[PDB]
Amino acid sequence: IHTARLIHTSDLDQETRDGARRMVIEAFRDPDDFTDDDWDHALGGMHALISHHGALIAHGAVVQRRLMYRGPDGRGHALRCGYVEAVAVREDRRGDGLGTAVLDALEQVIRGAYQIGALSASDIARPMYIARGWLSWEGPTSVLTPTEGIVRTPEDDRSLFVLPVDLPDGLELDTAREITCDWRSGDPW
Amino acid sequence: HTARLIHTSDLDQETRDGARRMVIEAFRDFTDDDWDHALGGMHALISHHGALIAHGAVVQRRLMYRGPDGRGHALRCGYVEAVAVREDRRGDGLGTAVLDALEQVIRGAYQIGALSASDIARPMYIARGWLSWEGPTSVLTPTEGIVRTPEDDRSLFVLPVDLPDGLELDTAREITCDWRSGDPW
Ligand SMILES: CC(C)(COP(=O)(O)OP(=O)(O)OC[C@H]1O[C@@H](n2cnc3c(N)ncnc32)[C@H](O)[C@@H]1OP(=O)(O)O)[C@@H](O)C(=O)NCCC(=O)NCCS
Ligand SMILES: CC(C)(COP(=O)(O)OP(=O)(O)OC[C@H]1O[C@@H](n2cnc3c(N)ncnc32)[C@H](O)[C@@H]1OP(=O)(O)O)[C@@H](O)C(=O)NCCC(=O)NCCS
Ligand SMILES: CN[C@@H]1[C@@H](O)[C@@H](O[C@@H]2[C@@H](O)[C@H](O[C@H]3O[C@H]([C@@H](C)NC)CC[C@H]3N)[C@@H](N)C[C@H]2N)OC[C@]1(C)O
């Protein structure tokens, strides 16, 4: 049985922070890339950590952002989103449920503080999100840019997963419709 | 005089409702959207015997800033919200202890802190290290473009903690926040 500890970015010491960052980059690389924008995107919220003999073996982070969604009534909602980033298990420790343990903890943050969880999954982790009941987003994805308007993001079109936990009053989320993230540098999703 | 720091996700329901009520009572108007804006980040709590007497929150947003090259930056921002102290206990430094714990989150976790405050708190914030934002402000809206936020009596303060790629801020230029319903700032 595995249990990740949850800890805010502000409570991570330099050592653990640099270590987490180096573990996640290693897990994603195979000697597309995990860049410093990808790491920056994982900062600011709650980290889930599992370590062994002082070494991080599993990491995940949930940060706040806004997801824009417009229903068929043409209204418009800016939902408080718990966005999951930098989920990773050290290669040699994979296949034993550490990844499940990270997501268990992050989902606890999502359900307790956000209206919706979302992420853009790597191909190897999609099965994990399906089995946990995340909803694959089927409509076009877009990003709200500063200077153009809402711009389509075709590279992200079949990778988004959502987890509606606390949608306002009577909002029905139609996965067939468009969805739009707020602006950031690097990959918007 | 030391406030404790708890993420929204670990607040039980009584604490949440208590904090919502206490902050409403302090603002004697705090709208329901104003409360939603306080949710999802770290709450600074000071309580006595089960009674919440000071609160504050810092939530994660993005502030857009354009340099002299036109290159744009979407800074990771810790936005201070719903700082309030029980009316009968003001003047004792609780508000300042709440600001202390929240600047700790900002320093540990964000590139920049930001808050909107009246000109009456302007000397304390300047004192505490915060820069007054003299330039224009706006919000990146979903259906229109970047729309100028009209001036009110509150002014915007930023706390440059950890600016990326050695960027230096020119408080005279534009700063625009990300979208949310209710008051964008
Ligand atoms: C994705 C990753 C974190 C998975 O970690 P892991 O510890 O091996 O995962 P777990 O052992 O906890 O597997 C959890 C569940 O995911 C699902 N799963 C993962 N791969 C699966 C597969 N090929 N077939 C079926 N289910 C699969 C399963 O339901 C599994 O439960 P199960 O094995 O009992 O069926 C890991 O491979 C990794 O670090 N990859 C690098 C790429 C990356 O970081 N992606 C981030 C995902 S957004
Ligand atoms: C603003 C507020 C949170 C401060 O709470 P507090 O416990 O009074 O805070 P502190 O004791 O640390 O300081 C109170 C402020 O008033 C000042 N103040 C209060 N009594 C004072 C006195 N007798 N002499 C001088 N200054 C006094 C404090 O020094 C500080 O402002 P200043 O230092 O710039 O003058 C409180 O007034 C409040 O809850 N207001 C209602 C909600 C609100 O307006 N919040 C917005 C915050 S930006
Ligand atoms: C539709 N093609 C996508 C592909 O683009 C790709 O999606 C990536 C997706 O993998 C990527 O996120 C992952 O990878 C990020 C980083 C390591 N770049 C690979 C870190 C966060 C992690 N969730 C997103 N930020 C961008 C998104 N386009 O992988 C899955 C996919 C279904 O094959």
Swiss-Prot record, chain B:
GO terms for molecular function: acyltransferase activity, transferring groups other than amino-acyl groups. It is an enzyme of class 2 (transferase). Keywords: Acyltransferase, Antibiotic resistance, Transferase. CoA binds at residues 83-85, 90-95. Substrate binds at residues 29, 81-82, 116, 151-152. The keyword Amino-acid biosynthesis does not apply. The keyword Transferase applies. GO terms for biological process: response to antibiotic. It comes from the Bacteria. It holds the Pfam family Acetyltransf_1. Residues 6-164 form the N-acetyltransferase domain. Its EC number is 2.3.1.-. Homodimer. Belongs to the AAC(2')-I acetyltransferase family. NCBIfam families: AAC_2p_Id. Catalyzes the coenzyme A-dependent acetylation of the 2' hydroxyl or amino group of a broad spectrum of aminoglycosides. It confers resistance to aminoglycosides. This is Aminoglycoside 2'-N-acetyltransferase. It comes from Mycolicibacterium smegmatis (strain ATCC 700084 / mc(2)155) (Mycobacterium smegmatis).
